[PDB]
Design a protein around this ligand. Structure first.
Ligand code: GFZ
Ligand code: GFZ
Lengths: 191, 191
């Protein structure tokens, strides 16, 4: 629709500059509509970012659900690499939305709640897998699974997004998947 | 001085509310000085936060330097616990400054550079220790030490500060030290 066109313009302009430096008129111009027509589809540029971030987080969540239902037939290290990769490729395919959506957590309760909701889901799934590994005798009973899951997910959020943003310091993007897989596997399976 | 009094007032008020909700007049009132007298000691409330954060980061850095020069005579797990504890206790003793200083990274190049400088120092020290452990045969040669060091430091930044801020999700503050020690030890020593 014109909705899709607003969303594509916003994602395009966020590659060039921050949300603060993009106007409703910039989004309207880019989508080939007037400013009042824009305000019919979105109440604000902030709502546009919230919708883009919702699409990215849901894309990651659905990719992870697909993997859960379709396990790779490979060793445990490659199965964890496949799962972390869902987040590497999904957020890594949408760096501008990832960056702007992380920044908006400070100023938008809706953005903070969206992020919070999905982190709780991803941590709960990670914890359930660690517990199932322990129950089948493949992983030792060390830390409480939900606490370990929490720290590993927060590590991935900070480390992936620092790499994508080219922060100083950061792990090079071409090394971050291997880095995170090593820490997940050693901390889940290590005595 | 009146400087110290401004800094104590600012740290006090940041426990109640964000920097945006604290006025120069609030800091002046709290330190028993006029607004123009305030502007003699600091150009802005933002400079006050930058100075508070500099003091906290330097306190952590000097505590770590003290430990490096005065190793605990205990096993490797307790030596890493002692070192992570420097960051747990120092930032954990200054939660309001930690929280406001992390938020200011978005809006202050000076705050971003301060944080960046010290993270590079702490990562470099972590990497040098991992290399020395590998050289003495106590740790296996797995990931590049500087990349592993980077991810472990970014994990600690995100996980400690989420715990202190009571974010949802977060590791409980009473469990975060043990959580991080487990992940550091398994990822540094694990094959
Ligand atoms: C042990 C063996 C039997 N199998 C292991 C692999 C499976 C099934 C079981 C499937 C998988 O793909 C997976 C992924 C994550 C998972 C969850 C979250 C992240 C993650 O990166 N967060 C993240 C990233 C950015 C921001 C916030 C969170 C990564 C992997 C957690 C468990 C999994 O189980
Ligand atoms: C192996 C054995 C021989 N000894 C291990 C302990 C020692 C000496 C050697 C001393 C120590 O206390 C230490 C601490 C850190 C260290 C560095 C950074 C953090 C950290 O938490 N970041 C952090 C926190 C918040 C925000 C940003 C970074 C923790 C520990 C790194 C190496 C160390 O070596």
């Amino acid at each position: 629709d014109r909705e899709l066109a607003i969303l594509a313009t916003a994602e395009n302009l966020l590659e060039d500059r921050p949300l603060a430096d993009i106007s409703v008129d910039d989004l309207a111009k880019g989508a080939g509509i007037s400013r009042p027509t824009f305000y019919f589809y979105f109440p604000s540029k902030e709502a546009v970012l919230l919708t883009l971030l919702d699409r990215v987080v849901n894309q990651a969540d659905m990719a992870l659900q697909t993997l859960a239902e379709n396990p790779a037939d490979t060793d445990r290290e490659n199965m964890w690499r496949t799962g972390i990769n869902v987040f590497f490729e999904t957020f890594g395919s949408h760096k501008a939305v990832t960056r702007a959506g992380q920044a908006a957590r400070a100023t938008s309760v809706e953005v903070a709640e969206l992020w919070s909701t999905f982190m709780q889901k991803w941590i709960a799934y990670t914890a359930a897998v660690i517990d199932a590994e322990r129950d089948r005798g493949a992983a030792p009973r060390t830390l409480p699974a939900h606490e370990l899951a929490t720290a590993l997910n927060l590590m991935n959020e900070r480390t992936l997004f620092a790499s994508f943003a080219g922060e100083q310091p950061s792990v090079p993007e071409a090394r971050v998947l291997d880095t995170l897989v090593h820490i997940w596997v050693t901390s889940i399976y290590g005595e």
